[PDB]
Symmetry: D2
Subunit: 368 residues, 4 copies
């Protein structure tokens, strides 16, 4: 049933992602000293100008200058020409900090969860590849292998598919577009070559690369001092690269800067969890699980399972399987997924879904 | 095939929407004097602090102080206590302004379009009601009828559905949550009453309100000097309320602040257009049209039509109907949809899809 | 030997003075917990936007949000229309805070000290009156007596003099100009009347007011929402109203935000001290003491005493009196003047010289 | 009558002076297109962050981005490591711009003027040398002769004097302190040597240098990425280096950013003019002319001439010479001194007094 699909991802230095990371680093910094710290913060950045905003009720002593600069350094902004230097940039902190199982969902909400068997991660090939492509250039940047590579990058992967009496099989990577920031002493010709051999061919399965696959490497020519200015970076503006790459459904809630008490984060994670568990348990090849909550109520106000005619069990057979194996009440979610743990910054770039190192990515047994 | 769904929308004073509007007012201000002005700007705001960023290549003389303050005044921030006064707020302009049919799409892209017959607008009931609810309080604010009403509001509408040998029929509004900023001299009891009688019951069809429908009006109590702070307002962070309320598919591109040359805006509008045309022409009851573009190429690199088994014609019958009635090349899109016109600010709040006053919302004939 | 002279002073809400006070409040906040805290900070403000900058090496835990807002509240900005509300203004903190007798002067320097017997304070009548005029409207503002009075004011006092076989005798207040911010419900006519009866006539000695004295009260008409925007307030820009009102000599060093280790502050205070001591001890009627320091050296590198032919003893008789009664080495100065004490914020408005409540204003005995 | 004196001056890249220059470049930019433009602006800066504030009523089209960046480039900030790059720094413009002989002084005021014959410029040796020292390193920076020299510097010159049956004769330069920002590839030993041979000895007259003169070159060691940060740069904070180096009298008014209608600027220039004219006409060796104005009145409300017993004519003989050769009414001052001319930015660094290229520095004939 042929159709094509494109997804994108951004590197650790893309301005928006710089902000998502700093906001989550501030969340990690509080969890380590107070796992009940209430965090609600966001970051805004513009060329060596970082603004930290937010209301956080906690009881931990934090050096925000330190957690902001350390995060910029980790991302790789240490020199001047790169567009950012953690040692010299303006970190204006305008953050306000106070001090002091069957909970109940804050804010009516509707979270979505998605999983597909086209990849071992149970994520769309398109977004999986987009993320790995960025992940790989960071590796090469940090190992020393490609020392011209700078932090800011963008990746787009378009794959041709075909349905299958149920749903979704990738056939080939139709085209790949990558742009990455770089140092001056490196030719456009040398960058393009390294991008194809060392990053693309080193992450994309042979099965998908072709004699026709189109490559668009550094299409706009040069991106040197293109460091994060990107006309103002912001938190919460990369909602689709943080999730499914345009593939499931998304209600609009951003993750970074919000602690584990916000259903937007927790519940979204819980819904991914059940979606991944279901395909993993052989119960379907592709699922879109929809969980609704009602302001005040703890127990979900209606969960819906949408297989795309890819399950043998039948929605409202699969619904019992979920109601017998999962307790999606907010509090139980944070307890089961170990959501008080400072794992948030790693979550802030390269996607929240797909990587197995996250609790919600470990499939539950599922006794059926 | 019962399921439930929730959508949300925000008023003209919600900080993010304040930013989306100012960005598009700056786009309008340029189009009026140079329809070829190249605009790429964003706004950030935080309590009487508005920052305008961006790169715009144009040849028009614009008073940004004037277009930023006029926009805040239009939204309704003229007094102090409201959280914003266009006469006193800091408008820091950091914008850089330069001077000098078969084009070809910039940036590989994948735009989505959606339409459904559950409402005359051809939009999900859930998001249509969410928007109308906010639209109505603005009317009452502006007429004088509810003079305690301030600009910032948030609305959530959750409707119970049932499929139908094809797709999607709303049955009832299960619950409604609304919070709106307000003046001090007005009781929580008086606000709640006016919200039910004068806004909810004056916009939601009798068929959907019930003796059980749940109302959550000003749940968090008061929201007086609330105003646009939300710790920070940003452009491009309300991507789902600008489109389908979590209903079609969304690849991630924001609209406000980008001119008509960006496929993220134009092509998204074009895809809504054909989706709306298709259901209007009786060819399906619900569609998800997917249009792909390839960097450099003008003609779409693959359009996909997904009816949900609600068309009698059959995808790749309906695809010919689209290829015989539409020319989705970028340049033809801006020409046919009159995209050089300064209509953008009206597009910046209450949704981009649904309102008939926009070119992309006038269904094309469709000769089949 | 007739001549005329004018001086000015500003109220606690003048933007520059708001900054001088916040910077010194931050200095007080550190001294109370670490009398060796090394403070070097400055503040910038612009309508409900306060930026705290600086490098301070100390070991005290301080809530800068708290010391900034408390200082704005103390000044009297609690409501919206006033141009500032400590509860709602943006306090962006960009401060960096580290942790860990015969000292020796940092930076070559030349401090000046001045005293005159025309007033009991040993300060020029012109600046003394200018300050008292502002001090009095604050009293009336804070008592309740003139409840329309807002924080920001400016005062200028011009007095006609006559020399006297030595130096300087005030004869009459030639003209007085005062502008003070105010609430809307108060007539220009009522403000002008209260300014003459209740503030001017209540602070200026009858001996100096005349049937000709000129009054310029609220000359520019109304100053209501004239709250601190004053197109950006700053620290260190009110160097002459902080000292002698244009009367001694001033080398350029600002006081606020600098701890007691900076010769600019300490030594200036020490020089005022000896100047006041000398006239107090009957040794001259008017003095300009000049103390020089050499980078690295502790003992002053040359002190000069300039009486204006008003001493009977003779410069270099008076120099021995000073060398026998004072040890102006930096460290001894901070020890004798109790300069580790958090008295700095009170120093930040209404002048550093004149008020007896400050150590440097208590005249030393002087054994001659 | 021996005494010693010290003065200081700062280079074009000292943060405060960066701000004084940008403010005056904005004033120049308006005068060139509207000599009646009413300018009242100030600049604030902090590491690649420049904020332009102010109210200017004018009728000229100005590209503030352009006049701010051109000014930073002129100063010499083009590379990254220098602490500033006009191509990458944040220039946030928050300026508001409107449109539409016997005038009469605005604001009661008291301006001071000073001149002395110890140098051909008729300025204190101490401040003349301090300025020339900075001027010289800029020359060498700009010529290529000392290519390690960066824009930010500070200079202090302390000279030993002796009175003379009238007033003030310099005897020798006691000590000189200079610190200048620099590039990494240059030794402290090489910088110190070049500062003594090529800048100090190339500007200070042999008569004043000695075998004992003390040199303090780059005392704090290195100052590489120093650049303009000083935690913050502001306009109007270098009031004494802009005038007499602590030598005449100063009432407190800053110059930069204020147009020629403000008596603070104009009248201060007028008072320097007569002071310079008087000593030039042989009528005294040292003068302190004091001109007072009354709000509303055009003709000066009392001018006082203080020779220090160095004139043969006698104050109130010299007063007639001034009243017969000068018309210090505000409007006549701007007309005679050609104050509508865009010469202000050159006035913004290296002192307002002393350089003959300025109208107020050309001595008037003086018919006695
Ligand atoms: C207490 O109500 C506050 C805020 C509201 N949710 C909004 O800003 O949209
Ligand atoms: C270590 O030197 C630094 C700074 C120098 N005094 C200046 O900024 O003027
Ligand atoms: K967010
Ligand atoms: K977004
Ligand atoms: K955007
Ligand atoms: K200062
Ligand atoms: K000053
Ligand atoms: K100024
Ligand atoms: Mg709520
Ligand atoms: Mg809000
Ligand atoms: Mg030093
Ligand atoms: Mg400096």
């Amino acid at each position: 049933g042929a159709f094509m699909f494109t997804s994108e991802s951004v590197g650790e230095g893309h301005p928006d992602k710089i902000c998502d990371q700093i906001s989550d680093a501030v969340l990690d910094a509080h969890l380590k000293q107070d796992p009940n710290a209430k965090v609600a913060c966001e970051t805004v950045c513009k060329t060596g100008m970082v603004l930290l905003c937010g209301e956080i009720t906690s009881m931990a002593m934090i050096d925000y200058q330190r957690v902001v600069r350390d995060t910029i350094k980790h991302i790789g902004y240490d020199d001047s020409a790169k567009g950012f230097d953690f040692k010299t940039c303006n970190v204006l902190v305008a953050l306000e900090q106070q001090s002091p199982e069957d909970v109940g969902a804050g804010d009516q909400g509707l979270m979505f969860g998605y999983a597909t068997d086209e990849t071992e991660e149970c994520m769309p090939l398109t977004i999986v590849l987009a993320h790995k492509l960025n992940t790989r250039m960071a590796d090469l940047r940090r190992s020393g292998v490609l020392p011209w590579l700078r932090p800011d990058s963008k990746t787009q992967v378009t794959v041709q598919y075909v349905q299958d009496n149920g749903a979704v099989i990738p056939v080939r990577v139709h085209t790949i577009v990558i742009s990455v920031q770089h140092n001056e002493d490196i030719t456009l010709e040398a960058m393009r070559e390294a991008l194809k051999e060392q990053v693309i061919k080193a992450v994309v399965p042979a099965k998908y690369l072709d004699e026709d696959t189109i490559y668009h490497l550094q299409p706009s020519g040069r991106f040197v001092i293109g460091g994060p200015q990107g006309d103002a970076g912001v938190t919460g503006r990369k909602i689709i690269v943080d999730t499914y790459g345009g593939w499931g459904a998304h209600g609009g809630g951003a993750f970074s800067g919000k602690d584990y008490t916000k259903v937007d984060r927790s519940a979204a994670y819980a819904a991914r969890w059940v979606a991944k568990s279901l395909v993993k348990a052989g119960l379907c090849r592709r699922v879109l699980v929809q969980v609704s909550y009602a302001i005040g109520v703890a127990e979900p106000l209606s969960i819906s399972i949408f297989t795309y005619g890819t399950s043998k069990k039948t929605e409202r057979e699969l619904l019992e399987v979920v109601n017998k194996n999962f307790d999606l009440r907010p509090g139980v979610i944070v307890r089961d997924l170990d959501l008080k743990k400072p794992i948030y910054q790693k979550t802030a770039c390269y996607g929240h879904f797909g990587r197995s190192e996250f609790p919600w990515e470990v499939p539950k047994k599922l006794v059926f």
